[PDB]
Amino acid sequence: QNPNAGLFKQGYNSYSNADGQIIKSIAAIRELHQMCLTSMGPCGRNKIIVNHLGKIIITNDAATMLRELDIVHPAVKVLVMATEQQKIDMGDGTNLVMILAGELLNVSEKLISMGLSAVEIIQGYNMARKFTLKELDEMVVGEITDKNDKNELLKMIKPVISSKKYGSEDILSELVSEAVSHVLPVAQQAGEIPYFNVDSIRVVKIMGGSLSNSTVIKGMVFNREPEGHVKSLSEDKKHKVAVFTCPLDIANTETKGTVLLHNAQEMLDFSKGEEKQIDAMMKEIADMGVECIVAGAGVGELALHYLNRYGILVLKVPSKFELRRLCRVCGATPLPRLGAPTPEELGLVETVKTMEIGGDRVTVFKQEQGEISRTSTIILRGATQNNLDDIERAIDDGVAAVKGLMKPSGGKLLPGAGATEIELISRITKYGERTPGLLQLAIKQFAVAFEVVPRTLAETAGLDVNEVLPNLYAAHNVTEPGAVKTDHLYKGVDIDGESDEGVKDIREENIYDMLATKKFAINVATEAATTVLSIDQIIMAKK
Amino acid sequence: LLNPKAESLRRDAALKVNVTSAEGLQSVLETNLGPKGTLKMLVDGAGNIKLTKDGKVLLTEMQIQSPTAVLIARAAAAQDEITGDGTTTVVCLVGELLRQAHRFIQEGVHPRIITDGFEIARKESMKFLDEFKISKTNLSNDREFLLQVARSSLLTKVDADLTEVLTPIVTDAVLSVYDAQADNLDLHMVEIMQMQHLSPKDTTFIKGLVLDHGGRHPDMPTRVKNAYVLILNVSLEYEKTEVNSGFFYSSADQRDKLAASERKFVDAKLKKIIDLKNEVCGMDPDKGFVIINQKGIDPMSLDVFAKHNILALRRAKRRNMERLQLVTGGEAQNSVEDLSPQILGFSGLVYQETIGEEKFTYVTENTDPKSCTILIKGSTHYALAQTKDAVRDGLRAVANVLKDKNIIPGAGAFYIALSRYLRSANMNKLGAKGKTKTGIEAFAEALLVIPKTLVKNSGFDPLDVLAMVEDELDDAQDSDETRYVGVDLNIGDSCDPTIEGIWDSYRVLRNAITGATGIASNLLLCDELLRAGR
Amino acid sequence: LLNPKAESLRRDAALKVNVTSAEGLQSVLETNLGPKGTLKMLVDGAGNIKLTKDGKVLLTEMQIQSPTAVLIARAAAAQDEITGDGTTTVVCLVGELLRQAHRFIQEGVHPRIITDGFEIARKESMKFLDEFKISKTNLSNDREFLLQVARSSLLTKVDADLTEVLTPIVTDAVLSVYDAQADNLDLHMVEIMQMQHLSPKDTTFIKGLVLDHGGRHPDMPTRVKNAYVLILNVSLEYEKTEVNSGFFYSSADQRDKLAASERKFVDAKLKKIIDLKNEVCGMDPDKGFVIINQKGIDPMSLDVFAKHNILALRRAKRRNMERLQLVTGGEAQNSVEDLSPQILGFSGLVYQETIGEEKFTYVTENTDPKSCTILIKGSTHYALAQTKDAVRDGLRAVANVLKDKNIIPGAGAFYIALSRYLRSANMNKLGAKGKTKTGIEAFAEALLVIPKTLVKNSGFDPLDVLAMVEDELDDAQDSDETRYVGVDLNIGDSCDPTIEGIWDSYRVLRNAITGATGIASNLLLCDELLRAGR
């Protein structure tokens, strides 16, 4: 009975602009905003994720949550896709986009309530974005010089690990910086040839113990045991390594090749045949000076008997990725066939041994002061399942951030701990004040959104935002001996958990953000916010 | 008077539901009109998001329940095969035409009376258009104007930041394929290609073709200043005997030597290919040699080609091979046995771009490629979809102007001036009927839905923008001068569209007016709504 | 923002309620405009049904629930006392003004902008009225004209056959009491009486007064020629001994003889009254004598008068006793003891009419009665109610014209000409505001609700009839002549109301537009409805 107007498409209840579709869409996003809001900062909060397959994990990482969430509402998908942008060609900024984009929408609603149109708001945000991106260029204090020194790496790696694992920052920073310094070449001013793929550093973890016994291996660590009799190689250098993709057994035949036996003599003759053919294949391997053999597949009993008699270490590596990575350690090329590991396709490893990590035995292919691998492995330990798994993720983030140090001025450093965000509030506001007309309304609110970072950093640290924020603002709203501010470009949030009051100088702990991460987040967050605002109606239909 | 399992609307209810349904469709699509309009979201039910403002996309991808709105959606969508634009305009015109007609029908005006009045207004509207339009200079070298055409089209569809990127791309891509001697053009000569891992602002114009399969050897050339192109349909993968055979050996050495003996068949073909390269600028400086082989190339032979500074591509798609024959001028060699310099084409700068996931080969700078490529970039599906449409929309807009030299100043100048014209001509002529005038008045008012909707979206007062245009037009008429007056959707006051650079196409305005008149008439003339078996 | 036991109606819903309700009230009364309108039956729930067209009665007695419709109905009732007519005109104007305003409000026109335009158009309408009116002669010998006025005010509310009966009744009744001197005009000098058992066609004008109580003796004249009138306030019923007494007698015959002596108390008064005639034209030819005694008269006293051909009436109402002193010129005597020849009045024929149930005495043909009576006939309260309203309003209509020489040609010429005037003056002046001109056009169009409704009720198509009036009106102006052009509700073509005889009141139309403007403005300016305590 009750009539309805405006709903004529498959009977859908689809809200128009006048029905507050934008406000309702933002309200849906706010649910995810609050979820991500408590992640940022060295004191961020953990979340429990129960995978539908029956696996329970704990993480600080918002991107992990967003990928584990089944996100339905298109208004949220816009920001989740924005998060993926931070993962593509960048190793950080996930929280910055989710938090900033949500706040930009929250302050937009305050403007919508005034009667300021979505078009006018979006136009102002685009202007404030372009202003913001320019202002960031002038906030640079230092710069990474890309000399790949351990100490230069630590300056960046430490704040990257922070906010994923707190309290172990120095231990994990040494683990990542050491492994990164292992794979990075010694060079200066060389940007023509790309290098340092994230895959160049593997992380391996065993349950039990703690990071107090962590280390870094110059080479690959495999979870497979030496199947053969020889469990280790000698102390000599340059052990020849052969790698096969063919299983180490009698060769097969492309068509049929089935042996049928009718007479006892035939059994004896075929048995001797196969044994001799396998020996010939194992002999030709040994005759090339091979002392270790790596199979991408299993090994027959006879092959083990012959390889043992030849003193060849037998190690199975079923993973195609590990075999490809092995080419970055020993240089060997996996042989598509069996019994002809041409010397040119042989690799060299200085040491192959078994090691006990956490109580579990693994096989290690490494070099020490020579024939140095292009891969590194970081060894983690920990007794607690949930904590160790997240520590592994912290290692990956450190490596990814180093990749962010790219030829196009990726080394530019800006004060962190919210110091950049606070200065932006002052500068963007002035841009608003100098802009005539209604444009100033959105430019000013654009600035307002940026206080969410020093707010969130305070909230997670247990501090009263109502005292920290006015102290942060007063710390930057100061009188300096000249037009250009100096000492008070470094005042940030003191993540201490202390009682009384105050701010902390970035210089005390070398808390810097990467310009490339910041400017990228500013672009992505604005596009996400303005995309949502541009949508005044959602209609579903068969495609 | 009704059979079971059926229903009909006999009284005026048939008209109320037809107008109401049209008003709904209007209230949705009106928000997409103009550069200041809003952006609609489409959900395919599988979780994929597509964003668009395009009338045709909105009408053809969205489902409609109201059977009357379906008729409007289909009739308006048909415009895509006639003009390529104006779909939203038609829907807006049809809605308001039915609104104004309904107001008069309530007074006892028979639908036929309005229909005849609409037809009289339509005929006079076409006369107005012919006198209102401006003849474009017949020169194709007028890049400055063609930029204005592409810009006007793009600003409707993109965020105005991508307009700065796409405008010169649309303009030059169409002009590049525009035939010499002021002839016609086929915009299908511009390939629309999507790629990921780059921002939408990186969208670029490529002078030639871009190929998917690249080189697969680390020593393949990165860039060659000038190269000859071998177009070859002969496989270079390790060959086996065509007849029953086998490798019968007593030793591993004989095993491989026998396999090599058959491999020599490929090496012999490679020798003839390399010998050709040696003959044709073999050691000449700033020269190279490219192979775009249709079939596979053995990793062994890729090592050979790289050592000879040859860029060897393999397993090219038919579409690339046929186009590359045209672009490079070479011929396809079906057998290396007849290989000769006469086979080779020629290209300028040839290089490969390395993208995290993919490689792309560029065969640009040809004598007469007769083809362009536009690379549409983005990180998301909806970003690629919106930009792709914006490019195709601009390409059609510019091509339409090059084909049809008739240009009409936009920004509402046509629709406001036409409304004034019809109101005056109707009383000066009185050539319809004392009651038919109601249809003409309804038509003249309905035309204003466009300047009103355009500004409504901009956020400026729809009432002031009309009065301001009226004031300026009145001065022009009293001064006995020709003046084109529109509305500036950024400032809110009036403007001259011929200085701002806002233009409509003759084909779009001609068919948008004719179509909307027919559609509204078809609904107004509906006497009964029949339902049986549904 | 809501308090319990309260409501705040927002989001322009208050305007939607105000307009919707006004269209309801308009729809009710729109069916009753002009001589072509319908009749309504009003049922009081007790079994008494009233038949009327009178807007004042309709709005007063009709139950209204919509608070907005109550506002309009009561505001019209205020105008009824001010103007004496125009009830339906006001309501129709208010409704259409709100309908036209609503259409523009939906388009973004602020209610105040329209309201200001209404005030401008109202002031300009009053200026037009001043040039539109015709100045009537001040002569009271304009009976031929006043007949047309009576027809205009009667024909609207009667069955068109009764018009022929009432036209001379209303016309001459007011002219009779209207002194032909610049003195004054009081329509209360015409009394309104009702009688049953005759057809409504028999409504009659009586030059004098009519009394209910008749004679109660068969030998008294029913027709007295050139009567003298005695006005007497004291009873002539059998009187008893002034003081307590009794009948003390010896023989039976003395009982009645003593009673006969007691009778002398009243008989002495009878002799004095009989001698009064003897002194004043006792035996003169063509003279009579009538007594209008306020108190009773004994059957024996009536016999005394009957023997002398005297018509002795009794138990007259005070209201007629006081008036008859003014009508006949005689003085009331509180007692026969003061009786003198100088007391008697004089009149012509005194007539006793007898019908089935009642008698009526007529005191016509007085020298200077300064009073008239109209007797409204009917069989039931249907004819009596409708006719009474027609007479009372007709007397007022012709009274206003006699008092106010300003007459307005009707037939819609006033309101149709206003539409043309405001349409042109607005476009010629444009001195209001770029936005306010919208309200002026809305006002000018709303004025046409009256000529359009008059035609619709006739069965003629308003679309053609209004057009024909506009055509001839324009032709007259192009011909540089003054012509009044209105609607012929019987033929369907145009007519000249100043030849046909269709006249409207100056004062009614002046205030009708001003009132309707205020009423519509008061509702258009209402942004929210505020309810509490209910």
Side-chain angles (χ1 to χ4, degrees), chain C residues 9-36:
Chain C
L9 184 62
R10 302 188 186 191
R11 299 183 180 176
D12 296 318
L15 292 170
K16 291 177 182 177
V17 171
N18 286 336
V19 175
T20 300
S21 292
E23 288 179 327
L25 186 60
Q26 179 181 344
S27 296
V28 174
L29 274 73
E30 187 174 85
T31 60
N32 175 30
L33 182 67
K36 306 293 176 181

Coordinates of all heavy atoms in Angstrom, one line a residue, chain C residues 9-36:
Chain C
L9 N 6.6 20.3 11.8 CA 6.5 19.8 10.4 C 7.4 20.6 9.5 O 7.2 21.8 9.3 CB 5.1 20.0 9.9 CG 4.8 19.4 8.5 CD1 5.0 17.9 8.5 CD2 3.3 19.8 8.1
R10 N 8.5 20.0 9.0 CA 9.6 20.6 8.3 C 9.8 20.1 6.9 O 8.9 19.4 6.4 CB 10.9 20.5 9.1 CG 10.8 20.9 10.5 CD 12.2 20.9 11.2 NE 12.1 21.2 12.6 CZ 13.2 21.5 13.4 NH1 14.4 21.5 12.9 NH2 13.0 21.8 14.6
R11 N 10.9 20.5 6.3 CA 11.3 20.0 5.0 C 10.2 20.4 3.9 O 9.9 19.6 3.0 CB 11.5 18.5 5.0 CG 12.6 18.0 5.9 CD 12.8 16.6 5.8 NE 13.8 16.1 6.8 CZ 14.2 14.8 6.9 NH1 13.6 13.9 6.2 NH2 15.1 14.5 7.8
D12 N 9.7 21.6 4.0 CA 8.7 22.2 3.1 C 7.4 21.4 3.2 O 6.5 21.7 2.4 CB 9.2 22.2 1.7 CG 10.4 23.1 1.5 OD1 10.4 24.2 2.0 OD2 11.3 22.7 0.8
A13 N 7.2 20.4 4.1 CA 6.0 19.7 4.2 C 4.8 20.6 4.6 O 3.7 20.3 4.2 CB 6.1 18.5 5.2
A14 N 5.1 21.6 5.4 CA 4.0 22.5 5.8 C 3.4 23.2 4.5 O 2.2 23.4 4.5 CB 4.6 23.6 6.7
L15 N 4.3 23.6 3.6 CA 3.8 24.1 2.3 C 3.0 23.1 1.5 O 2.0 23.4 0.9 CB 5.0 24.6 1.4 CG 5.7 25.9 2.0 CD1 7.0 26.1 1.2 CD2 4.8 27.1 1.9
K16 N 3.5 21.8 1.5 CA 2.7 20.8 0.8 C 1.3 20.6 1.4 O 0.4 20.4 0.7 CB 3.5 19.5 0.8 CG 4.8 19.5 0.0 CD 5.5 18.2 0.1 CE 6.8 18.2 -0.7 NZ 7.6 17.0 -0.6
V17 N 1.3 20.6 2.7 CA 0.0 20.5 3.4 C -0.9 21.7 3.1 O -2.1 21.6 2.8 CB 0.1 20.4 4.9 CG1 -1.2 20.5 5.6 CG2 0.8 19.1 5.3
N18 N -0.4 22.9 3.2 CA -1.1 24.1 2.9 C -1.7 24.1 1.5 O -2.9 24.5 1.3 CB -0.3 25.4 3.1 CG -0.1 25.6 4.6 OD1 -0.9 25.2 5.5 ND2 1.0 26.4 4.9
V19 N -0.9 23.7 0.5 CA -1.4 23.8 -0.9 C -2.4 22.6 -1.1 O -3.4 22.9 -1.7 CB -0.2 23.7 -1.9 CG1 -0.6 23.6 -3.3 CG2 0.7 24.9 -1.7
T20 N -2.0 21.4 -0.7 CA -2.9 20.3 -0.9 C -4.3 20.6 -0.3 O -5.3 20.4 -0.9 CB -2.4 19.0 -0.3 OG1 -1.1 18.7 -0.9 CG2 -3.3 17.9 -0.5
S21 N -4.3 21.1 1.0 CA -5.6 21.4 1.6 C -6.4 22.5 0.9 O -7.6 22.4 0.7 CB -5.4 21.9 3.0 OG -4.9 20.8 3.8
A22 N -5.7 23.6 0.4 CA -6.3 24.6 -0.4 C -6.9 24.1 -1.6 O -8.0 24.5 -2.0 CB -5.3 25.7 -0.7
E23 N -6.2 23.2 -2.3 CA -6.8 22.6 -3.5 C -8.0 21.8 -3.2 O -9.0 21.7 -4.0 CB -5.8 21.7 -4.2 CG -4.6 22.4 -4.9 CD -3.6 21.5 -5.5 OE1 -3.4 20.4 -5.0 OE2 -3.0 21.8 -6.5
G24 N -8.1 21.1 -2.0 CA -9.3 20.5 -1.6 C -10.5 21.5 -1.5 O -11.5 21.3 -2.1
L25 N -10.3 22.6 -0.7 CA -11.3 23.6 -0.5 C -11.7 24.2 -1.9 O -12.9 24.4 -2.1 CB -10.9 24.6 0.5 CG -12.0 25.7 0.8 CD1 -13.1 24.9 1.5 CD2 -11.4 26.7 1.8
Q26 N -10.7 24.5 -2.7 CA -11.0 25.0 -4.1 C -11.9 24.0 -4.8 O -12.9 24.4 -5.4 CB -9.7 25.2 -4.8 CG -9.9 25.8 -6.2 CD -8.6 26.0 -7.0 OE1 -7.6 26.0 -6.4 NE2 -8.7 26.1 -8.3
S27 N -11.5 22.7 -4.8 CA -12.3 21.7 -5.6 C -13.8 21.7 -5.1 O -14.7 21.5 -5.9 CB -11.7 20.4 -5.4 OG -10.4 20.3 -5.9
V28 N -14.0 21.9 -3.8 CA -15.4 21.9 -3.3 C -16.2 23.1 -3.9 O -17.2 22.9 -4.6 CB -15.4 22.0 -1.8 CG1 -16.9 22.1 -1.3 CG2 -14.8 20.7 -1.2
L29 N -15.7 24.3 -3.7 CA -16.4 25.5 -4.2 C -16.2 25.7 -5.6 O -17.1 26.4 -6.2 CB -15.9 26.7 -3.4 CG -16.6 26.9 -2.0 CD1 -16.1 25.9 -1.0 CD2 -16.2 28.3 -1.5
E30 N -15.2 25.2 -6.3 CA -15.1 25.4 -7.7 C -16.3 24.9 -8.5 O -16.6 25.4 -9.5 CB -13.8 24.7 -8.2 CG -13.5 25.0 -9.7 CD -12.1 24.4 -10.1 OE1 -12.1 23.2 -10.5 OE2 -11.2 25.1 -10.1
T31 N -16.9 23.8 -7.9 CA -18.1 23.3 -8.6 C -19.3 24.2 -8.5 O -20.3 24.0 -9.1 CB -18.5 21.9 -8.0 OG1 -18.7 22.0 -6.6 CG2 -17.3 20.9 -8.2
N32 N -19.2 25.3 -7.7 CA -20.3 26.2 -7.5 C -19.8 27.7 -7.7 O -19.6 28.4 -6.8 CB -20.9 26.1 -6.1 CG -21.9 27.1 -5.8 OD1 -22.6 27.5 -6.7 ND2 -22.1 27.4 -4.5
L33 N -19.7 28.0 -9.0 CA -19.4 29.4 -9.4 C -20.2 29.7 -10.7 O -20.2 28.9 -11.6 CB -17.9 29.5 -9.7 CG -17.4 30.9 -10.2 CD1 -17.6 31.9 -9.0 CD2 -16.0 30.9 -10.6
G34 N -21.0 30.8 -10.6 CA -21.7 31.2 -11.7 C -23.1 30.6 -11.8 O -23.4 29.7 -11.0
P35 N -24.0 31.1 -12.7 CA -25.3 30.5 -12.9 C -25.3 29.0 -13.3 O -26.3 28.3 -13.2 CB -26.0 31.3 -13.9 CG -24.8 31.9 -14.7 CD -23.7 32.2 -13.6
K36 N -24.1 28.5 -13.8 CA -24.0 27.1 -14.3 C -23.5 26.2 -13.2 O -23.3 25.0 -13.4 CB -23.0 27.1 -15.5 CG -23.4 28.0 -16.6 CD -24.7 27.6 -17.2 CE -25.2 28.6 -18.3 NZ -26.4 28.2 -18.9

